[PDB]
Coordinates of C-alpha atoms and ligand atoms in Angstrom, one line a residue:
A9 CA -54.7 -64.6 15.3
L10 CA -54.3 -64.9 18.9
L11 CA -55.3 -67.6 21.4
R12 CA -58.3 -66.9 23.5
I13 CA -58.5 -68.8 26.8
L14 CA -62.1 -70.0 27.3
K15 CA -64.2 -70.9 30.4
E16 CA -66.6 -73.7 30.4
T17 CA -69.5 -71.4 30.6
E18 CA -68.5 -69.5 27.4
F19 CA -69.4 -72.4 25.0
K20 CA -71.8 -75.2 24.7
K21 CA -71.8 -78.4 22.7
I22 CA -74.7 -78.9 20.4
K23 CA -74.1 -82.4 18.8
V24 CA -71.5 -84.8 17.6
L25 CA -69.7 -84.3 14.2
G26 CA -67.3 -87.2 14.6
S27 CA -64.7 -88.9 16.6
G28 CA -61.6 -91.1 16.6
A29 CA -58.4 -91.9 18.7
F30 CA -57.8 -88.2 19.1
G31 CA -61.1 -87.7 20.9
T32 CA -64.4 -86.3 19.6
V33 CA -65.5 -83.3 17.6
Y34 CA -68.8 -81.4 18.4
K35 CA -70.7 -78.7 16.8
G36 CA -71.3 -76.0 19.3
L37 CA -71.8 -72.4 20.1
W38 CA -69.2 -69.9 21.5
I39 CA -70.5 -67.0 23.3
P40 CA -67.5 -64.8 24.4
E41 CA -68.1 -63.5 27.8
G42 CA -70.0 -60.2 27.7
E43 CA -69.7 -59.9 23.9
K44 CA -73.3 -60.7 23.1
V45 CA -72.2 -62.6 20.1
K46 CA -73.0 -66.2 19.3
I47 CA -70.2 -67.9 17.2
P48 CA -70.7 -71.3 15.7
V49 CA -67.7 -73.4 16.4
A50 CA -66.4 -77.0 16.2
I51 CA -65.3 -78.2 19.7
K52 CA -62.5 -80.8 19.7
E53 CA -62.3 -82.6 23.0
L54 CA -59.2 -84.7 23.3
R55 CA -58.8 -88.0 25.3
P60 CA -51.1 -85.5 31.0
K61 CA -48.9 -82.5 30.0
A62 CA -48.8 -79.6 32.3
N63 CA -51.3 -76.9 31.3
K64 CA -48.3 -74.5 30.5
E65 CA -47.2 -77.0 28.0
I66 CA -50.5 -77.4 26.4
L67 CA -51.1 -73.6 26.1
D68 CA -47.7 -73.1 24.5
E69 CA -48.6 -75.6 21.9
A70 CA -52.1 -74.1 21.6
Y71 CA -50.4 -70.6 21.1
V72 CA -48.4 -71.8 18.2
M73 CA -51.4 -73.6 16.6
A74 CA -53.4 -70.5 16.9
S75 CA -50.9 -68.3 15.1
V76 CA -51.5 -70.5 12.0
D77 CA -53.6 -67.9 10.0
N78 CA -54.3 -68.9 6.4
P79 CA -57.5 -69.0 4.3
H80 CA -57.0 -72.7 3.5
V81 CA -56.0 -73.9 7.0
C82 CA -58.7 -74.4 9.7
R83 CA -57.9 -72.0 12.4
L84 CA -57.7 -72.6 16.2
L85 CA -59.8 -69.9 17.9
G86 CA -59.5 -70.9 21.5
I87 CA -58.8 -73.5 24.1
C88 CA -60.5 -74.6 27.4
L89 CA -58.4 -76.3 30.0
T90 CA -60.5 -78.5 32.5
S91 CA -60.7 -82.1 33.3
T92 CA -60.4 -82.5 29.5
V93 CA -58.6 -80.5 26.8
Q94 CA -61.1 -78.8 24.6
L95 CA -60.0 -77.0 21.3
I96 CA -62.3 -74.4 19.8
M97 CA -61.9 -74.3 16.1
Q98 CA -63.7 -72.8 13.1
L99 CA -66.7 -74.7 12.1
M100 CA -66.6 -75.9 8.6
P101 CA -70.4 -76.2 7.7
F102 CA -70.2 -78.8 4.8
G103 CA -67.9 -81.4 6.5
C104 CA -64.9 -83.1 5.1
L105 CA -64.1 -82.9 1.3
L106 CA -64.0 -86.7 1.0
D107 CA -67.7 -87.1 1.9
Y108 CA -68.6 -84.0 -0.1
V109 CA -67.4 -85.2 -3.4
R110 CA -68.9 -88.8 -2.9
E111 CA -72.2 -87.0 -2.4
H112 CA -72.2 -84.4 -5.0
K113 CA -70.2 -86.2 -7.7
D114 CA -72.9 -85.7 -10.2
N115 CA -72.7 -81.9 -9.9
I116 CA -69.1 -81.3 -9.4
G117 CA -67.3 -79.6 -12.5
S118 CA -63.7 -79.2 -13.5
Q119 CA -63.6 -75.7 -12.1
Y120 CA -64.3 -76.7 -8.5
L121 CA -61.9 -79.7 -8.6
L122 CA -59.0 -77.7 -9.9
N123 CA -59.7 -74.8 -7.5
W124 CA -59.7 -77.3 -4.5
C125 CA -56.2 -78.4 -5.6
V126 CA -55.0 -74.9 -5.7
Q127 CA -56.4 -74.1 -2.3
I128 CA -55.0 -77.2 -0.7
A129 CA -51.6 -76.5 -2.2
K130 CA -51.9 -72.9 -1.1
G131 CA -52.5 -74.1 2.4
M132 CA -49.8 -76.8 2.6
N133 CA -47.2 -74.1 1.2
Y134 CA -48.2 -71.8 4.1
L135 CA -47.6 -74.7 6.6
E136 CA -44.3 -75.3 4.9
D137 CA -43.3 -71.7 5.4
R138 CA -44.1 -72.3 9.0
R139 CA -42.0 -75.4 9.1
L140 CA -45.0 -77.6 9.9
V141 CA -45.0 -81.1 8.5
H142 CA -48.7 -82.3 8.3
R143 CA -48.1 -86.1 8.0
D144 CA -51.8 -87.0 7.5
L145 CA -53.1 -85.1 4.4
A146 CA -55.9 -86.8 2.8
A147 CA -59.2 -85.8 1.4
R148 CA -60.9 -86.9 4.8
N149 CA -58.8 -84.2 6.5
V150 CA -59.7 -81.4 4.2
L151 CA -62.8 -79.6 5.3
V152 CA -65.5 -77.5 3.4
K153 CA -66.2 -74.0 4.4
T154 CA -68.3 -73.5 1.2
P155 CA -68.3 -75.6 -2.0
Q156 CA -65.9 -72.9 -3.3
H157 CA -63.6 -72.8 -0.2
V158 CA -61.9 -75.6 1.6
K159 CA -59.4 -75.8 4.5
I160 CA -56.9 -78.3 5.6
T161 CA -57.4 -79.5 9.2
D162 CA -55.1 -81.5 11.7
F163 CA -56.1 -84.2 14.2
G164 CA -52.7 -84.4 15.9
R165 CA -50.1 -86.0 13.5
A166 CA -48.6 -82.6 12.5
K167 CA -45.1 -81.7 13.7
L168 CA -43.1 -78.4 13.9
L169 CA -39.5 -78.8 12.7
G170 CA -36.7 -77.3 14.7
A171 CA -34.5 -74.6 13.2
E172 CA -31.9 -77.1 12.0
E173 CA -34.2 -80.0 11.4
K174 CA -34.8 -80.9 7.7
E175 CA -37.1 -84.0 8.5
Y176 CA -39.1 -85.4 11.1
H177 CA -38.2 -88.9 12.4
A178 CA -41.3 -90.6 13.7
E179 CA -41.8 -93.1 16.4
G180 CA -44.5 -95.8 16.7
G181 CA -47.5 -93.8 16.0
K182 CA -50.1 -95.6 13.7
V183 CA -49.7 -94.4 10.2
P184 CA -52.2 -94.0 7.1
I185 CA -50.0 -96.2 4.8
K186 CA -51.9 -95.6 1.6
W187 CA -51.3 -91.9 1.7
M188 CA -47.7 -92.2 2.8
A189 CA -44.5 -91.6 0.8
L190 CA -42.2 -94.6 0.4
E191 CA -39.6 -93.3 2.7
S192 CA -42.0 -92.6 5.5
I193 CA -43.2 -96.2 5.3
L194 CA -39.7 -97.7 5.2
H195 CA -37.9 -95.3 7.5
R196 CA -40.4 -93.3 9.4
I197 CA -39.0 -90.1 7.7
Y198 CA -41.4 -87.2 7.2
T199 CA -40.7 -84.0 5.1
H200 CA -42.6 -81.3 3.3
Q201 CA -41.8 -83.5 0.3
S202 CA -43.5 -86.5 1.9
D203 CA -46.6 -84.3 2.4
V204 CA -46.2 -83.5 -1.4
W205 CA -46.7 -87.4 -2.0
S206 CA -49.8 -87.3 0.3
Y207 CA -51.0 -84.2 -1.7
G208 CA -50.8 -86.2 -4.8
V209 CA -52.9 -89.1 -3.4
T210 CA -55.5 -86.5 -2.1
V211 CA -55.7 -85.1 -5.5
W212 CA -56.2 -88.5 -7.0
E213 CA -59.1 -89.0 -4.4
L214 CA -60.8 -85.9 -5.7
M215 CA -60.4 -86.7 -9.4
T216 CA -62.1 -90.1 -8.8
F217 CA -64.8 -88.5 -6.7
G218 CA -63.8 -90.1 -3.4
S219 CA -62.6 -93.5 -4.6
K220 CA -60.4 -95.7 -2.4
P221 CA -56.7 -95.7 -3.4
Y222 CA -55.2 -99.2 -3.9
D223 CA -58.8 -100.6 -3.5
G224 CA -58.5 -104.1 -2.1
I225 CA -54.8 -104.2 -1.5
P226 CA -53.8 -104.8 2.1
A227 CA -51.8 -101.9 3.7
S228 CA -49.0 -104.5 4.3
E229 CA -48.5 -104.9 0.6
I230 CA -48.1 -101.3 -0.4
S231 CA -44.5 -100.7 0.2
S232 CA -43.6 -103.6 -2.1
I233 CA -46.1 -102.4 -4.8
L234 CA -44.5 -99.0 -4.8
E235 CA -41.1 -100.4 -4.9
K236 CA -42.0 -102.2 -8.1
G237 CA -43.0 -98.9 -9.5
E238 CA -46.7 -99.3 -9.5
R239 CA -48.8 -96.1 -8.7
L240 CA -52.5 -95.2 -8.7
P241 CA -54.0 -95.2 -12.1
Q242 CA -55.1 -92.3 -14.4
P243 CA -58.6 -91.2 -13.3
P244 CA -61.2 -91.3 -16.2
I245 CA -61.7 -87.4 -16.2
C246 CA -58.1 -86.6 -16.1
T247 CA -56.0 -85.5 -19.2
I248 CA -52.5 -86.8 -19.0
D249 CA -51.2 -83.3 -18.1
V250 CA -53.0 -83.5 -14.7
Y251 CA -52.1 -87.2 -14.2
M252 CA -48.5 -86.6 -14.8
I253 CA -48.5 -83.8 -12.0
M254 CA -49.8 -86.6 -9.7
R255 CA -47.1 -89.0 -10.9
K256 CA -44.3 -86.4 -10.3
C257 CA -45.7 -86.2 -6.6
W258 CA -45.0 -90.0 -6.3
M259 CA -41.4 -90.2 -7.6
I260 CA -39.2 -92.1 -5.3
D261 CA -36.7 -89.4 -4.9
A262 CA -38.4 -86.8 -2.6
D263 CA -36.4 -84.0 -4.2
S264 CA -37.7 -85.1 -7.7
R265 CA -41.1 -84.2 -6.5
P266 CA -42.6 -80.7 -7.2
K267 CA -42.8 -78.3 -4.3
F268 CA -46.1 -76.9 -3.0
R269 CA -45.2 -73.6 -4.6
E270 CA -44.7 -75.2 -7.9
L271 CA -48.1 -77.0 -7.5
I272 CA -49.9 -73.6 -6.7
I273 CA -48.6 -72.2 -10.0
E274 CA -49.3 -75.4 -12.3
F275 CA -52.9 -75.9 -10.9
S276 CA -53.6 -72.1 -11.0
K277 CA -52.8 -72.2 -14.6
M278 CA -55.0 -75.3 -15.2
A279 CA -57.8 -73.7 -13.4
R280 CA -57.9 -70.9 -15.8
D281 CA -58.9 -73.3 -18.6
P282 CA -60.4 -76.0 -16.6
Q283 CA -62.4 -77.9 -19.3
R284 CA -59.0 -78.2 -21.0
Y285 CA -57.5 -80.4 -18.3
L286 CA -60.5 -82.3 -16.8
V287 CA -63.1 -84.1 -19.1
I288 CA -66.5 -84.0 -17.4
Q289 CA -69.8 -84.6 -19.2
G290 CA -72.1 -81.7 -19.0
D291 CA -69.4 -79.4 -17.7
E292 CA -70.5 -77.2 -18.9
Ligands
63A301 C1 -64.4 -87.2 5.9 C2 -64.0 -87.0 7.3 C3 -65.1 -86.4 8.1 O1 -66.2 -86.1 7.8 N1 -64.6 -86.1 9.5 C4 -65.7 -85.5 10.5 C5 -64.8 -84.8 11.6 C6 -64.4 -83.4 11.2 O2 -64.6 -82.5 12.5 C7 -64.9 -81.3 12.0 N2 -66.1 -81.0 11.3 C8 -66.5 -79.9 10.9 N3 -67.7 -79.7 10.2 C9 -68.6 -80.6 9.9 C10 -68.6 -82.1 10.2 N4 -69.6 -82.7 9.6 N5 -70.4 -81.6 9.1 C11 -71.7 -81.9 8.4 C12 -69.9 -80.5 9.3 N6 -65.7 -78.7 11.3 C13 -64.6 -78.9 11.9 N7 -63.7 -78.0 12.2 C14 -62.6 -78.5 12.7 C15 -62.8 -79.9 12.9 C16 -64.0 -80.2 12.2 C17 -63.5 -85.6 11.5 C18 -63.5 -86.9 12.7 F1 -64.6 -87.6 12.4 F2 -62.4 -87.5 12.6 F3 -63.7 -86.5 13.8 C19 -63.4 -86.2 10.1

């Protein structure tokens, strides 16, 4: 995987797929010059660093090559910064489970957990801390295949850095580990906490975590030992894995490599671990 540098004439926006603080994402078409191939893409236009700085960051981001991480295919530097990324046809996993909750069986749910863990482990191998993992930021290539994406909170750790110490950026409190909330510390093990919350979202078919609790109250609730409840479809074996992801000591929590193994085992006999009517 290498970074293509794109001219404005090489791609065209087709429609909006979403937007936020980072900017706006469009569905579009990439026609590499002279190549006679139309490639469906998602174009992320951001809302200034020197071009050389932006490119160097884009080069690193484009080297991230894993089946379960959405890849940066190219970049166009004009008045605005535009990132050309793989288009995920089915949108975010959060919307997908909400929509299709009547037709989602244990096999798909457990496979998604495996895939997200595989992607996160790859990021860890690259020393990348995601810092914003949630079902809304997992995208669907096909119902059978999902990819983690990133809208700018991810950080690369230095050779000797074991943690990221954040500044004042706004934070998704209900997905964050307690040490991130209290001390702005982020590690792969804090990503594991967020992973556990993401899995809870899937197992409840897109339900809201800590529903009707103010974000400002979350740290105190977690300090008292309260955690998200066991989803109706979850056997205790699955729930206990989620609970391990939310232990106060980051090194108590499993590693993504260990989560891959445990969920892969469960995905081999899925009806044993998730209880879903009509499944199958
Ligand atoms: C649950 C969160 C959510 O839906 N979004 C939408 C966008 C995602 O931006 C991207 N979308 C897609 N594909 C897609 C979107 N909608 N459909 C029907 C398909 N592929 C992408 N590849 C990279 C980025 C993509 C973000 C938001 F709104 F923040 F921009 C979260």
